[PDB]
């Protein structure tokens, strides 16, 4: 197993990071709580389990509640593994790096936790549970900030997991793309994606966005239309995948016919998107790229005669935000919108990323151009009304909008666009 | 017809509300749909699950921050959440029965709620939120018990919704069955079910159980094997569907070849299952049927020579529970395991389970317009079989035959049946699911 070799280095890195912070904050150790199952109100049914990101940072156990990791960075990390033996229920490489204790029932954990928890930092969601167990330090900000800062630097093990994540997601994206050109409904396209990725809905790192025509302009679109539209014009799919707790996050936009103004508009955004990806470089502030994206959107708006102005004028008047209202992208890893994106240092001192770009960091680059009713209405109420080609806006509105998103690893002397290296056009 | 039936539904809920607020000296009742739960340290959210007490009034189950204010005399007030931000996209029959006011942001609901919330009962999950608004009565038990008791009596509207929920589920079960005989994996079978029901995973009222071979013996099996088994022997699917907040809950078990001892075992269990369905009748304690199920499971174990005893002997020695460890079934409606099933009166008193089965919680006396599941089972579970082998009943068990039947896992057959005054309506088998 190639992962096993890399994982040995991963643990050693986390141990080193753990040593530094527990010594700095004068702690005996850190306790990571995987989480618990949430029960639905007045019911005996449960929400799907979502593991604490700080927990799965150590190991690929993301489907098991009531698990505990006790670490100080010097000794082997203690893993309290939940494993019920009741009759209604029911070894790998990472197992050898932990001292594993089996937990048969949730409230039996206290006998397995350290006796004096005065200087053990509880890292988890369930503060009432932590207090009941005797923990007093819960998610200490210096500790959270330290881990979150270094989470931006992915180990070789993590990079491998994120590559496999894209690989699965790209398979889904190609299958979804094929379903679109066959005239399938949003629901059917989603089924094709889930089938190709072999993912259940709750396996996807975020709710898939599967939008046809006007629905493409809906930034937080979640629904899946069961009925295919009479006419197929555009398709926007924002979807990813999971591998070992690590996420992919990819968006592609398609014109149905492959020709016409919207088809050219998509391709223009593509060339801009690729150009923005290749601007990723160590020592460079991510905010610089976001600014350049606005320039490129303004040029696009100008070239396609959507706004009757030059690119620089569109930027100065603040018109671009009407068509591109969100951030250029974000760090990605264990979390889709990964932590540490705003941090200037370990202490912890719209756009989701402003942090200086360094090697071993992973980003998304997702420029967008949309025709959104409420935003266009606001623009029409300003003095910029005169500058807008409203006829052109009316022409492109039925196509909804455009977003193109890749996941890129930044290396010291090169860039690794995982998504496009997997040949997803 | 649904629009017509819904008028009577609202009238019924109004009258129930009038009775309970008068009895408990209340000004009204507030039903909170709930909120979206955010994942720890993240900006991703859990799927929204609506408060059952809220969707009891209306078919709005995908909307948080909604509030219903009712006293049973005036029209029920519906505070409907409907944001206008540019990230979101911005009149059915049920709308006319509510005085609707739109809520654009969740923290603006206080302006729409009653001024004096002292005698207004808050029915919701978010206590500190309600306390912050001014509410003081948090899910008062006499109010909870009263509503939950009468929740057992489904209105004509609710029955119609449950028929449709069952109609959808059966379409899935047929597609799943076909996939099984085509030799597909558990994951592929689940995909077929979701497609045929046009359900997303989070639309299903519970996590589907799609089990092949030995997995059929796992009662709380949740995984979906991506790899098809090299040998195809058995298939158990426990799966339902949603319509307007109401649930279906259906189980079927299949033998792959349709021949052999396990195939005959499934066939025998089916005839028992149908017979148990027809035992549903007004005036009977549900525990009476549970007892008969154990008798029939014992008879099956005896006839197939799995246990070398008569049916009475197997029951008396408490051996049946090794092969049939759970309850015969439950009330079903807005919730899969619906409320009120253990209540003797509307005060919340418990109808005690029959002797020998202290863990049976569906015990309430059967009446018309109540909806039940009938799910007898016969499984071969390692843990329970191990327990049996350690007892003095070890000598009575045909262990060689058990070993031959173990790779097939187990059997469960489940329908959803409406009890009427004169007849029984097996919704599942009416929809032509063998
Ligand atoms: Mn120190
Ligand atoms: Mn210090
Ligand atoms: Mn995305
Ligand atoms: Mn993204
Ligand atoms: Mn041009
Ligand atoms: Mn069931
Ligand atoms: Mn059931």
């Amino acid at each position: 197993n190639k992962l096993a070799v890399l994982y040995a280095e991963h643990i050693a890195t986390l141990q080193k990071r753990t040593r530094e912070i527990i010594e700095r904050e004068n702690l005996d150790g850190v306790v990571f709580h995987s989480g618990q199952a949430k029960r639905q109100f007045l019911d005996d049914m449960y929400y799907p389990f979502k593991v604490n990101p700080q927990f799965k940072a150590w190991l690929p156990v993301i489907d098991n509640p009531h698990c505990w990791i006790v670490a100080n960075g010097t000794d082997k990390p203690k893993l309290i593994f939940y494993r019920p033996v009741d009759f209604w229920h029911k070894n790998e490489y990472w197992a050898d790096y932990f001292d594993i204790e089996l937990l048969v029932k949730p409230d039996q954990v206290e006998k397995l936790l350290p006796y004096d928890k005065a200087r053990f930092a509880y890292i988890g969601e369930y503060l009432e549970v932590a207090q009941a167990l005797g923990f007093e330090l819960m998610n200490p900000e210096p500790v959270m900030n330290f881990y979150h800062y270094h989470r931006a630097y992915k180990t070789q093990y993590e990079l491998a997991c994120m590559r496999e994540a894209n690989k699965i997601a790209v398979q889904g994206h190609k299958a979804a793309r094929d379903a679109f050109f066959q005239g399938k409904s949003e629901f059917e396209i989603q089924q094709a994606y889930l089938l190709a990725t072999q993912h259940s809905e709750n396996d996807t790192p975020f709710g898939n966005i599967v939008a046809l025509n006007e629905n493409c302009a809906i930034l937080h679109y979640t629904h899946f239309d069961r009925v295919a539209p009479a006419t197929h014009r555009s398709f926007l799919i924002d979807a990813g995948a999971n591998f070992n707790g690590y996420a992919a996050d990819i968006t592609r936009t398609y014109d149905f016919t492959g020709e016409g103004e919207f088809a050219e508009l998509v391709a223009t955004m593509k060339q801009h998107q690729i150009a923005l990806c290749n601007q990723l470089a160590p020592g460079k502030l991510y905010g610089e790229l976001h600014l350049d994206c606005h320039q490129r959107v303004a040029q696009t708006l100008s070239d396609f005669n959507i706004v009757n102005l030059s690119a620089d004028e569109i930027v100065a008047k603040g018109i671009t935000s009407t068509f591109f209202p969100h951030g250029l992208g974000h760090h990605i890893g264990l979390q889709v919108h990964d932590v540490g994106g705003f941090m200037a240092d370990e202490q912890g001192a719209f756009l989701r990323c402003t942090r200086k770009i360094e090697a071993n960091q992973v980003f998304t680059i997702e420029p967008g151009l949309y025709f959104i009713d409420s935003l266009l209405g606001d623009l029409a109420a300003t003095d910029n009304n005169q500058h807008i080609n409203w006829d052109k806006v009316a022409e492109l509105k039925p196509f909804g909008g455009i977003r193109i998103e890749d996941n890129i690893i930044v290396h010291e002397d090169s860039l690794e666009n995982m998504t496009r290296e997997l040949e997803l056009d």
Side-chain angles (χ1 to χ4, degrees), chain A:
Chain A
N1 199 332
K2 297 217 307 176
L3 271 180
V5 171
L6 298 182
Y7 185 77
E9 183 177 76
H10 180 74
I11 291 298
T13 299
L14 296 195
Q15 287 281 68
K16 170 175 162 102
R17 295 181 183 179
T18 299
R19 275 195 304 277
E20 170 67 21
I21 189 55
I22 67 113
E23 285 177 1
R24 186 184 300 177
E25 293 308 298
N26 309 289
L27 305 171
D28 283 333
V30 180
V31 179
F32 304 92
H33 189 197
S34 76
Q36 302 186 170
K38 296 178 180 298
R39 185 177 56 82
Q40 299 179 30
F41 180 57
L42 296 179
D43 209 11
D44 55 4
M45 294 295 166
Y46 290 80
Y47 291 86
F49 175 76
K50 302 299 183 185
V51 61
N52 174 13
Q54 293 268 352
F55 178 88
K56 60 168 177 178
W58 288 82
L59 81 175
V61 174
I62 65 172
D63 65 338
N64 201 14
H66 313 299
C67 290
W68 304 75
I69 293 176
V70 181
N72 52 25
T74 56
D75 303 320
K76 288 214 304 181
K78 166 69 61 60
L79 174 63
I80 301 174
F81 190 83
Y82 180 58
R83 187 158 167 257
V85 304
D86 47 75
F87 70 89
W88 47 92
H89 292 148
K90 223 201 174 270
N91 175 70
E92 298 190 59
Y93 63 92
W94 49 259
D96 290 321
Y97 295 85
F98 297 86
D99 290 324
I100 302 177
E101 296 286 345
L102 297 177
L103 187 61
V104 73
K105 106 168 163 193
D107 58 352
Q108 276 179 22
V109 61
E110 195 180 359
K111 73 166 164 23
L112 300 177
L113 292 174
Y115 180 80
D116 184 20
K117 313 175 192 62
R119 272 289 140 182
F120 282 89
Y122 170 86
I123 307 301
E125 174 185 358
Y126 300 90
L127 308 181
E128 274 63 52
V129 171
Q131 179 177 347
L133 290 172
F135 290 103
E136 314 204 59
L137 306 181
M138 303 178 192
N139 305 314
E141 187 172 14
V143 177
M144 308 298 296
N145 293 344
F146 177 87
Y147 279 122
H148 286 165
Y149 182 82
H150 293 283
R151 276 262 300 276
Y153 311 107
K154 273 68 180 176
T155 66
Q156 284 295 94
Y157 165 77
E158 300 185 292
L159 292 181
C161 288
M162 298 195 64
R163 290 185 183 102
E164 183 67 11
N166 250 94
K167 188 181 176 184
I168 300 171
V170 165
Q171 289 308 110
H173 269 271
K174 292 181 177 182
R177 171 237 282 151
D178 293 343
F180 164 60
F181 287 111
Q182 288 162 2
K184 299 302 173 56
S185 73
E186 293 180 353
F187 183 77
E188 295 174 315
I189 293 175
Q190 169 72 351
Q191 305 321 293
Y193 186 96
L194 294 179
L195 179 62
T197 58
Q198 289 181 321
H199 275 47
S200 299
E201 187 174 44
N202 288 322
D203 291 328
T204 63
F206 60 93
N208 282 5
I209 300 178
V210 183
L212 292 177
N213 299 347
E214 293 86 6
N215 291 342
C216 298
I218 307 169
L219 297 185
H220 287 355
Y221 186 63
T222 58
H223 188 50
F224 301 115
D225 276 340
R226 267 62 170 176
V227 176
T231 305
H232 286 83
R233 296 186 297 270
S234 65
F235 174 49
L236 190 157
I237 173 170
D238 193 339
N242 161 77
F243 184 81
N244 285 19
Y246 293 85
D249 183 13
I250 303 168
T251 312
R252 286 299 189 271
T253 298
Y254 305 87
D255 175 270
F256 184 77
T257 67
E259 60 182 54
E261 189 127 340
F262 182 72
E264 300 167 9
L265 194 62
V266 167
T268 284
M269 289 299 294
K270 170 181 175 178
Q271 299 303 324
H272 282 317
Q273 188 271 342
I274 298 182
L276 284 165
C277 289
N278 295 331
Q279 289 184 44
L280 287 170
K284 193 173 187 180
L285 290 177
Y286 191 88
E288 300 182 34
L289 301 203
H290 179 67
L291 268 41
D292 188 55
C293 181
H294 276 266
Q295 178 80 2
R296 291 181 177 268
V297 170
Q299 184 62 78
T300 303
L301 294 168
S302 187
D303 293 338
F304 282 81
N305 303 89
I306 300 174
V307 181
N308 301 320
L309 295 171
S310 61
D312 289 340
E313 272 181 305
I314 300 180
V315 172
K317 295 184 179 302
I319 299 181
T320 67
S321 295
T322 299
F323 301 89
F324 175 58
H326 60 76
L328 177 60
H330 51 92
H331 285 254
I332 180 173
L334 288 156
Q335 302 175 232
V336 176
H337 303 141
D338 212 4
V339 296
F342 287 145
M343 309 186 65
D345 50 41
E346 298 175 345
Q347 283 63 46
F350 261 97
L351 184 58
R352 293 177 179 268
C353 181
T354 56
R355 179 170 174 175
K356 186 188 61 177
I357 297 165
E358 295 186 70
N360 298 316
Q361 293 181 356
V362 193
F363 303 88
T364 75
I365 294 289
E366 40 183 326
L369 204 168
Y370 318 91
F371 305 98
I372 308 173
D373 287 331
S374 58
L375 290 185
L376 291 168
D378 295 328
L379 174 59
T382 67
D383 62 335
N384 286 325
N385 186 304
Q386 54 182 348
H387 302 294
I388 308 306
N389 193 336
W390 296 106
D391 285 340
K392 178 64 65 177
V393 171
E395 289 176 356
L396 294 169
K397 186 182 299 175
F399 295 87
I402 305 168
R403 181 163 69 257
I404 304 175
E405 178 178 24
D406 292 323
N407 304 149
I408 307 95
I409 305 175
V410 175
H411 298 285
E412 312 175 10
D413 304 290
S414 71
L415 298 175
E416 186 179 346
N417 191 327
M418 296 182 288
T419 313
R420 295 199 176 270
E421 283 185 358
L422 286 157
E423 300 182 17
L424 182 69
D425 301 326

